[PDB]
Amino acid sequence: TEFKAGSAKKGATLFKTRCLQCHTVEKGGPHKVGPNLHGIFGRHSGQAEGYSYTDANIKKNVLWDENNMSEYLTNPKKYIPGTKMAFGGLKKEKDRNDLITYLKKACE
Amino acid sequence: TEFKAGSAKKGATLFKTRCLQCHTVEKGGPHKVGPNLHGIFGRHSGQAEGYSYTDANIKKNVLWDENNMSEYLTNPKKYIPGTKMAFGGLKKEKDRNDLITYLKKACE
Amino acid sequence: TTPLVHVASVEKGRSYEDFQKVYNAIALKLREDDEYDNYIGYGPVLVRLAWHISGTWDKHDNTGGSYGGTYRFKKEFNDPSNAGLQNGFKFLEPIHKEFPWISSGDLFSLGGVTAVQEMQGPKIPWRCGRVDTPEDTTPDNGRLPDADKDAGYVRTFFQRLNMNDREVVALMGAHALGKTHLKNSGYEGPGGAANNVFTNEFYLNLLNEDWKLEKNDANNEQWDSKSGYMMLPTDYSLIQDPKYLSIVKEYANDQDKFFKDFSKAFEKLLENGITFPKDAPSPFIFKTLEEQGL
Amino acid sequence: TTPLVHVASVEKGRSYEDFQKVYNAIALKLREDDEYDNYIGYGPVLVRLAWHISGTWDKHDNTGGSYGGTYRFKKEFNDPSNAGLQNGFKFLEPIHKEFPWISSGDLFSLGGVTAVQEMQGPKIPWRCGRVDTPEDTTPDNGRLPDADKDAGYVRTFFQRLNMNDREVVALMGAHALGKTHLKNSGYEGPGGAANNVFTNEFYLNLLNEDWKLEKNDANNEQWDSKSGYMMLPTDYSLIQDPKYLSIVKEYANDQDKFFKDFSKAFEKLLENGITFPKDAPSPFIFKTLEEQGL
Numbered sequence: 001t002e003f004k005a006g007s008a009k010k011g012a013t014l015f016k017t018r019c020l021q022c023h024t025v026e027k028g029g030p031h032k033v034g035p036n037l038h039g040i041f042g043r044h045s046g047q048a049e050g051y052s053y054t055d056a057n058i059k060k061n062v063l064w065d066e067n068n069m070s071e072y073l074t075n076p077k078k079y080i081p082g083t084k085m086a087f088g089g090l091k092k093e094k095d096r097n098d099l100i101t102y103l104k105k106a107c108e
Numbered sequence: 109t110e111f112k113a114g115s116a117k118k119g120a121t122l123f124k125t126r127c128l129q130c131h132t133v134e135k136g137g138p139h140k141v142g143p144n145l146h147g148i149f150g151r152h153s154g155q156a157e158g159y160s161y162t163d164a165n166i167k168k169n170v171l172w173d174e175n176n177m178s179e180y181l182t183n184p185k186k187y188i189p190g191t192k193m194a195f196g197g198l199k200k201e202k203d204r205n206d207l208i209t210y211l212k213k214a215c216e
Numbered sequence: 217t218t219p220l221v222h223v224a225s226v227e228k229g230r231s232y233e234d235f236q237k238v239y240n241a242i243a244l245k246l247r248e249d250d251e252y253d254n255y256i257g258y259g260p261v262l263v264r265l266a267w268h269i270s271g272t273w274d275k276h277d278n279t280g281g282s283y284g285g286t287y288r289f290k291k292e293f294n295d296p297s298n299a300g301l302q303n304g305f306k307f308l309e310p311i312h313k314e315f316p317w318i319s320s321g322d323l324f325s326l327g328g329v330t331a332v333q334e335m336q337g338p339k340i341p342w343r344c345g346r347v348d349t350p351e352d353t354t355p356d357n358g359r360l361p362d363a364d365k366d367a368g369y370v371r372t373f374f375q376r377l378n379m380n381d382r383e384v385v386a387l388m389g390a391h392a393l394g395k396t397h398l399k400n401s402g403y404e405g406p407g408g409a410a411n412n413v414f415t416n417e418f419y420l421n422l423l424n425e426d427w428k429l430e431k432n433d434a435n436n437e438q439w440d441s442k443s444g445y446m447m448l449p450t451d452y453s454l455i456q457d458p459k460y461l462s463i464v465k466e467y468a469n470d471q472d473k474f475f476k477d478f479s480k481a482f483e484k485l486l487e488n489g490i491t492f493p494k495d496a497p498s499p500f501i502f503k504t505l506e507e508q509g510l
Numbered sequence: 511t512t513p514l515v516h517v518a519s520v521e522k523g524r525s526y527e528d529f530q531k532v533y534n535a536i537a538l539k540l541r542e543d544d545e546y547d548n549y550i551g552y553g554p555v556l557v558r559l560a561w562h563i564s565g566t567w568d569k570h571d572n573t574g575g576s577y578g579g580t581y582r583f584k585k586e587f588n589d590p591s592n593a594g595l596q597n598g599f600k601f602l603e604p605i606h607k608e609f610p611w612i613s614s615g616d617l618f619s620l621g622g623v624t625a626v627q628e629m630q631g632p633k634i635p636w637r638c639g640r641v642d643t644p645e646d647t648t649p650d651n652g653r654l655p656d657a658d659k660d661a662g663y664v665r666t667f668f669q670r671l672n673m674n675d676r677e678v679v680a681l682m683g684a685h686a687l688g689k690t691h692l693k694n695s696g697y698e699g700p701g702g703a704a705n706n707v708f709t710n711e712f713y714l715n716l717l718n719e720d721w722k723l724e725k726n727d728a729n730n731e732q733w734d735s736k737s738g739y740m741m742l743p744t745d746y747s748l749i750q751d752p753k754y755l756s757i758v759k760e761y762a763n764d765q766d767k768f769f770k771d772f773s774k775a776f777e778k779l780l781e782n783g784i785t786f787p788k789d790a791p792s793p794f795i796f797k798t799l800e801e802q803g804l
């Protein structure tokens with residue numbers, strides 16, 4: 001595949017600093033500023049229950065795979081204009097590979 | 109000093125995959141396209157024992173310490189124009205923090 | 217002899233293009249070393265640095281400000297209000313060596329402007345011409361405000377900086393960026409979720425979170441929320457005072473208004489004590505990295 | 511029916527300031543990903559990508575050439591046999607997603623240009639207007655030069671690409687960038703010390719290094735140096751052929767003459783098979799990342 005495989009051990013440290021504050025991981029995770037990230041790979045956009053999404057997030061209805069994710073994580077407002085997720089965006093492809101590597105197993 | 113140091117391991121590759129084609133690390137090492145790099149700290153702007161050298165660098169005649177020479181590898185043509193040092197380079201502080209540490213030790 | 221007169225004279229043969237070079241260098245290094253302070257970046261500390269420098273201004277005798285840009289030693293960085301700023305100076309001097317022609321004040325102010333815009337903030341017009349001064353021009357300690365006071369203190373303090381009620385609620389929105397450090401100030405934690413993205417979260421979190429007084433490990437009191445947030449007593453005073461509270465709610469419902477007013481306020485803050493001649497160039501609105509394709 | 515006519519059609523609402531953004535994104539990604547292929551960079555693989563997609567051109571029927579940009583289709587490349595270029599493509603499609611308005615042909619032509627200028631190379635004028643044409647047009651391979659041949663083969667091959675002796679010695683200067691991967695081509699090793707810097711070291715090594723015919727583990731013969739350098743027989747043929755040997759020594763003495771010639775040649779190679787309408791603007795000359803403060 002086009003993306004590479006990174007390290008979940010340095011992909012989790014990247015999550016605990018940059019994602020964990022807005023997103024949880026494990027089953028039945030509490031909804032924070034952002035929704036719970038579990039089973040995100042294989043489901044459409046903004047389809048997790050009990051959360052209030054902006055229109056634009058649901059409208060694109062893209063199916064989160066390991067590649068289009070890295071596109072959204074490098075520029076969250078560019079991939080989905082009007083999103084209420086406030087994030088600077090990852091500019092290092094390593095950081096994108098390492099995180100998704102972790103997200104793949106963390107979100108099984 | 110104001111410039112930190114890195115681990116004594118990772119960038120040993122950054123001397124062999126990056127600076128090996130020119131610079132040697134041992135005592136009385138054979139000259140290549142670059143001079144024998146040893147004792148470099150405390151020595152001059154192109155001593156280059158037994159090696160062809162343009163005037164364009166011993167111009168400065170400034171010693172090579174940790175501080176003054178941190179702009180040396182960022183952009184060679186910038187700190188000493190008209191030279192023959194041609195290399196790709198590195199733009200992150202970590203790699204510069206690293207390679208010095210091995211040529212601070214193996215270049216004693 | 218009249219209060220100190222500080223005239224803004226541009227460096228020899230410098231223009232718009234020359235300064236974006238520095239802006240680009242700052243904005244890039246801002247991206248490069250993104251591991252600093254647990255991946256918050258040098259964003260907030262550069263903004264705070266610009267505030268602290270400009271925060272030494274006194275409108276009565278025109279001392280301090282960002283003009284002189286001349287202090288290398290705010291009584292050494294350990295105990296008073298300036299702890300943590302030394303990381304900001306270490307961010308700047310490698311950029312100062314490749315641009316030795318730029319002044320300290322300009323590099324201090326521009327660095328503040330660069331961080332705001334790069335953190336997706338508003339566009340803040342920046343001007344040049346700040347000139348460095350010698351030792352006898354050095355501002356000192358005790359110029360900047362203490363964290364645990366009330367709305368009466370903030371009001372009377374910012375008067376010295378020529379800032380009204382609306383202009384301080386705007387500037388205090390910058391406290392949505394980064395976090396307090398116990399090792400530094402004596403307070404711990406963020407007051408928001410996005411510490412490296414310029415928003416109006418400061419005002420929303422202020423009146424939408426549940427705050428309770430609590431003592432940190434430095435035995436100082438502060439307002440904590442159950443979401444893990446925190447607010448300095450001076451910050452919480454902005455909803456205690458009615459005149460402040462009306463503006464807080466306003467910026468809460470309108471971020472576009474907050475951005476507009478922050479820019480005027482921030483620019484004014486970084487320009488206090490400066491006398492710009494009329495033959496001086498118009499303010500600079502720099503292009504971000506995202507605009508240049510990055 | 512006449513040979514095909516490929517007419518340059520500029521992307522809509524797009525000017526110089528647009529492709530400069532793309533250029534920058536390419537050049538910054540070059541600098542962000544430096545760990546590729548034992549710290550060489552994506553420089554070499556991007557220069558080859560442009561060469562490879564412009565190299566399938568055939569002046570007799572005007573088939574192939576960079577205009578098409580049809581190479582994203584799988585039928586085009588066998589992969590392997592042209593192996594190594596799958597990394598060149600995996601480098602570009604996120605940039606293709608950041609700019610979905612640019613055509614494929616325009617992209618990995620610009621990438622080939624961006625790579626050179628960032629690798630200390632000469633400034634090469636580039637143009638827009640190449641359009642994707644996968645329908646009915648997918649250039650079959652076997653149109654590309656074999657490695658195990660000689661000066662007669664090279665000369666007769668490049669005439670098909672409308673290239674005379676001077677041009678092909680200049681374009682062979684690019685084989686100072688990168689290295690041969692035994693897993694990809696069947697040959698192993700670099701032919702220079704600077705693999706990520708555009709110089710004239712190529713012509714220097716041919717005349718100043720001693721070469722021995724040696725087999726490799728892939729059983730193919732090659733010319734190997736004492737310094738660890740190597741050459742393809744097609745490259746080594748340039749010092750064998752007297753007419754080629756003349757031009758080789760010129761670029762070895764004068765590097766600036768080579769920079770002017772490579773620019774003229776490499777651009778021509780990229781624009782081969784394209785008829786630009788006279789209403790089309792003058793070729794762009796992109797500023798590098800260095801001269802933008804970055």
Ligand code: HEC
Binds near residue numbers: 022
């Ligand atoms: C790494 C730092 C991050 C990753 C990986 C993700 N986020 Fe966020 N998040 C936040 C909000 C307010 C939303 C909803 C926005 C809207 O609905 O318009 C989200 C959503 C996501 C999604 C999409 C999930 C879906 O569509 O069902 C993904 C894939 C995601 N997040 C991953 C909030 C924040 C936030 C607040 C400060 C931060 C730092 C991050 N998110 C960061 C990451």
Ligand code: HEC
Binds near residue numbers: 127156195
């Ligand atoms: C060739 C492909 C080189 C690479 C890669 C690197 N260097 Fe270099 N180095 C090279 C040359 C040709 C010269 C001097 C010759 C001349 O005429 O100028 C040098 C010199 C140095 C020096 C100074 C030597 C002295 O006596 O003062 C230093 C400190 C140095 N090189 C360091 C260095 C580092 C850290 C590199 C990679 C990270 C590196 N060089 C790459 C050739 C080449």
Ligand code: HEC
Binds near residue numbers: 260261
């Ligand atoms: C326009 C910008 C701005 C203004 C005005 C401002 N601040 Fe801040 N301040 C910041 C930023 C940004 C930070 C975050 C720094 C960090 O995270 O390292 C900060 C952090 C702090 C800290 C903690 C620093 C640390 O390292 O823990 C204190 C204390 C502080 N400010 C005091 C004040 C007080 C008191 C006022 C006004 C009464 C004030 N500042 C006004 C921008 C500002």
Ligand code: HEC
Binds near residue numbers: 554557656664681682
């Ligand atoms: C204008 C540019 C250009 C021209 C013309 C060109 N090449 Fe190359 N070629 C490159 C570059 C750049 C590389 C280095 C790629 C790398 O390091 O992955 C390369 C590498 C190669 C490789 C090894 C690739 C690998 O992955 O091992 C072969 C084989 C090769 N070239 C054959 C040829 C032959 C044969 C010719 C002409 C007769 C030719 N090329 C003409 C640019 C060019």
Ligand SMILES: Cc1ccc(N)c(C)c1
Binds near residue numbers: 392394395405447
């Ligand atoms: C989000 C935030 C940032 C900095 C400071 N100082 C505070 C109180 C909150």
Ligand SMILES: Cc1ccc(N)c(C)c1
Binds near residue numbers: 684686688690740
């Ligand atoms: C430096 C170099 C570049 C490319 C190739 N193919 C070779 C053999 C050497």
